[PDB]
């Protein structure tokens, strides 16, 4: 079973954004259907939940979106959607479409209502100083600065290193988010082996490859 | 509205172990109480319906009961793989709400940081910014302080923490660290050092660079 999540980014307070969902692998016209949001603030929230065909796709909303949101469905299409419109900050989160029960979950998208501007980010080598010590293995790293909003994914060459990698929740300062990453890899193996970190962000449309080589 | 209530907001257990998680309905909700293991940067997956019927494919270590208000999540053996955030929800009226969650952390052996430092790089020197980094990696317990001397002496302005979820491989937290200084001030100092202080020792871990270098 899936639910692909289409939708999501950066809205100004005030503002619309329509989030869609495509199932596979279950009978969507014979499942009733949620939309679910979260954050830090107040964790997982249910939103809105439509029914079937034979009882008219009648719905339920949580009063705090109710004659703001939208859930609709397609089902021709296997899709379920929410329009959102007259946005609040305070509907920042993740949103996921569900299944009756919660059975089945889409992967998420992180809607973000703020004024604040697209930034696309820096992302700075992080690279040993020439004279630190001598060790087995090297840690290296990645430092990606001033962007908004979230999210940002970071890999390392491309997805093919990910065993010695820890990449850190971002944090947010006057309106531009901070993360970092670290891999760690056999000291034999670099420089001679490349390692390069892929910084994607897709709310300004931007990836930044950025290889690490010795200072 | 039904407010179902989670706590403690955290259990640390080691592999084998048996653990139970409780659940708290503000109102008799019958049998219409869920359970959901959500780990990080993922969606929540469904353990348990109607109480305590285990949707298919869990593992029979996880089992449900309770009904009308208290409500429990057994894990006969935790595994390794368990680690994550388990929250109840009910269905019973609306708006369906959800359990604050409780997570699971693995119990291990307590283990030192692995501490790199990096000074900035030319391109965010020549933005005016000067960001020295510290990753502490590969510790256990969860709990651990950095601290930054630049020429000896401690500076507290200008930090940036970020802490890891525990790590589903190896059982493991790490952190890092950023201290952030204009180019300015950075190229009027010398030496710049991170200090890691760990329950494994009193002691920091000590990494430096100096700008000669």
């Known amino acids: 079973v899936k639910l692909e999540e289409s939708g999501g980014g950066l809205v100004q307070p005030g503002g619309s954004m329509k989030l869609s969902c495509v199932a596979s692998?279950?009978?969507?016209?014979?499942?009733?259907m949620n939309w679910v949001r979260q954050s830090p603030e107040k964790g997982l929230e249910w939103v809105a939940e439509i029914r079937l065909k034979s009882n008219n796709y009648a719905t339920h909303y949580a009063e705090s979106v109710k004659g703001r949101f939208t859930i609709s469905r397609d089902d021709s299409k296997s899709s379920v959607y929410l329009q959102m419109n007259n946005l609040r900050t305070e509907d920042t989160g993740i949103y996921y479409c569900?299944?009756?029960?919660?059975?089945?979950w889409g992967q998420g998208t992180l809607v973000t209502v703020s004024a604040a501007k697209t930034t696309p980010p820096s992302v700075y080598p992080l690279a040993p100083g020439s004279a630190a010590q001598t060790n087995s293995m090297v840690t290296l790293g990645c430092l990606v600065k001033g962007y908004f909003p979230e999210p940002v994914t970071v890999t390392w060459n491309s997805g093919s290193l990910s065993s010695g990698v820890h990449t850190f929740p971002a944090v947010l300062q006057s309106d531009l988010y901070t993360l970092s990453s670290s891999v760690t890899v056999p000291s034999s193996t670099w420089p001679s082996e490349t390692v390069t970190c892929n910084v994607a962000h897709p709310a300004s449309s931007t990836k930044v490859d950025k290889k690490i080589v010795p200072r | 509205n039904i407010v179902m209530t989670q706590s403690p907001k955290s259990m640390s257990m080691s592999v084998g172990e048996r653990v139970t998680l409780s659940c708290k309905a503000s109102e008799n909700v019958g049998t219409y109480v869920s359970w959901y293991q959500q780990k990080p940067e993922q969606s929540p997956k469904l353990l348990i319906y109607?109480?305590?019927n285990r949707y298919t494919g869990v593992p029979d270590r996880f089992t449900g009961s309770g009904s009308a208000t208290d409500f429990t999540l057994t894990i006969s053996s935790v595994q390794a793989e368990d680690l994550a955030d388990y929250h109840c929800?009910?269905?019973?009226?609306?708006?369906?709400?959800f359990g604050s969650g409780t997570k699971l952390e693995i119990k291990r052996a307590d283990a030192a940081p692995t501490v790199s430092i990096f000074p900035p790089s030319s391109e965010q020197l020549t933005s005016g910014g000067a960001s020295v980094v510290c990753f502490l990696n590969n510790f256990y317990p969860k709990d651990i302080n950095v601290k930054w001397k630049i020429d000896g002496s401690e500076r507290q302005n200008g930090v940036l923490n970020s802490w890891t979820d525990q790590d589903s491989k190896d059982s493991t937290y790490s952190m890092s660290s950023t201290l952030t200084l204009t180019k300015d001030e950075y190229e009027r100092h010398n030496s710049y050092t991170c200090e890691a202080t760990h329950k494994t020792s009193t002691s920091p871990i000590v990494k430096s660079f100096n700008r000669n270098e």
């Open positions: 929800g009910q269905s019973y009226s609306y708006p369906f709400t």
């Open positions: 692998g279950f009978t969507f016209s014979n499942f009733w």
């Open positions: 569900t299944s009756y029960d919660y059975e089945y």
């Open positions: 109607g109480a305590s």
